From a paper:
Here, we report our experience in establishing the P. pastoris strain that expresses a PET hydrolytic enzyme from Caldimonas taiwanensis termed CtPL-DM that was identified from sequence mining from GenBank and modified by the DM strategy. In contrast to the protein expressed in Escherichia coli, CtPL-DM expressed in P. pastoris is inactive in PET degradation.
We thus constructed N181A to remove the N-glycosylation and found that the PET hydrolytic activity of this variant was restored. PET hydrolytic activity measurement indicates that F235L and CC are the most promising variants, whose activity was elevated by more than 60% and ~ 20% activity at 60 ºC, respectively. The crystal structure of the inactive variant of F235L, termed F235L-S155A, was successfully solved, which shares a highly identical overall fold to those of CtPL-DM and CtPL-DM-S155A. Since the attempt to obtained substrate/analogue-bound complex failed, the MHET in IsPETase/MHET complex structure was modeled into these apo-form structures to investigate their substrate-binding modes. This is similar to that was observed in the complex structure of LCC-ICCG and should be considered as a factor to render the higher activity. In addition to the substrate-binding tunnel, the structure of F235L-S155A also provides an opportunity to visualize the N181A-mediated effects. In all three structures, the TPA-binding W180 adopts conformations that should collide with the MHET. Nonetheless, W180 in F235L-S155A, which carries N181A mutation, shall be able to wobble freely.
Residue numbers in the entry: 24 to 202, 210 to 230, 233 to 239, 241 to 280, 282 to 292
């Protein structure tokens, strides 16, 4: 009995579409929060306590460019806050701090009976994700906050790959072959559970056309690590992953099994 397990036993097709949790979304206003630029909160309406995921857009990106991830993750049983940055021009380090703020905001809101997500978040199970500089942001957050359960940097950008040589959070990186992501993956300690999947734009991961495959891989990673849902092992390490990776995928690395 995994107490964090949610949703039906997984299938490829169910992971290639919006999931079985009905979700609502609300706007988090800039005026309500000091540590980030507000954003879009997606949450399963169904009773329960869920893992919390904060997702960063990249450089000049808005929460609206990442709504795919809000809906896709939340609809498979996560509370997902797609942040807007304090400015469009915020660097990775600032995106990292804003992702950490967004997760702390989710923990604070969890405890307020005023909040639609009152008692809906397991504040012990947090993950980060983001696109480009938001990817670098997610990975810096995960570096600084090893209690986090998972990171998914998608087309990650940073000024240094050696910055990630202490990452201790299970990290799935998405690459777009015709775009940095590999030096980042190589820098992560091989003692850290990690996975690289290269799709064949820079915004091939952004709201992209490989939505099916990237969504499946991403939900699977959050399930496996945020929920400890070993039902998804076939989808991140086993026969299903190997099917995905063998097809659309130019290259993949991992240190499977986990």
């Amino acid at each position: 009995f995994n107490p964090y397990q949610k949703g039906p036993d997984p299938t490829a097709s169910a992971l290639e579409r919006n999931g079985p949790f009905a979700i609502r979304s609300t706007s988090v206003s800039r005026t309500s929060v000091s540590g980030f630029g507000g954003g879009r909160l997606y949450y399963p309406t169904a009773s329960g306590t869920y893992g919390a995921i904060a997702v960063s857009p990249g450089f000049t990106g808005t929460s609206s460019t990442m709504t795919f991830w809000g809906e896709r993750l939340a609809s498979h049983g996560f509370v997902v806050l797609v942040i807007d940055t304090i400015t469009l021009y915020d660097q990775p380090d600032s995106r990292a701090r804003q992702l950490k703020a967004a997760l702390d905001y989710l923990a604070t809101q969890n405890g307020r009976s005023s909040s639609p997500i009152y008692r809906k978040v397991d504040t012990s199970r947090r993950a980060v994700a983001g696109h480009a500089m938001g990817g670098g942001g997610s990975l810096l957050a995960a570096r600084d906050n090893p209690s986090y359960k998972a990171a998914i940097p998608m087309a990650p950008w940073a000024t240094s790959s050696t910055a990630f040589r202490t990452v201790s959070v299970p990290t799935m990186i998405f690459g777009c072959q015709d775009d940095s992501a590999i030096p980042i993956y190589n820098a992560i300690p091989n003692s850290t559970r990690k996975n690289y999947v290269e799709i064949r734009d820079h915004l091939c991961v952004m709201n992209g056309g490989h939505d099916a495959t990237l969504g499946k891989l991403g939900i699977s990673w959050m399930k496996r690590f945020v929920d400890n849902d070993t039902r998804y092992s076939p989808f991140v390490c086993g026969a299903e992953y190997n099917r995905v990776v063998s097809s659309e995928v130019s290259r993949s690395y991992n240190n499977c099994p986990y």
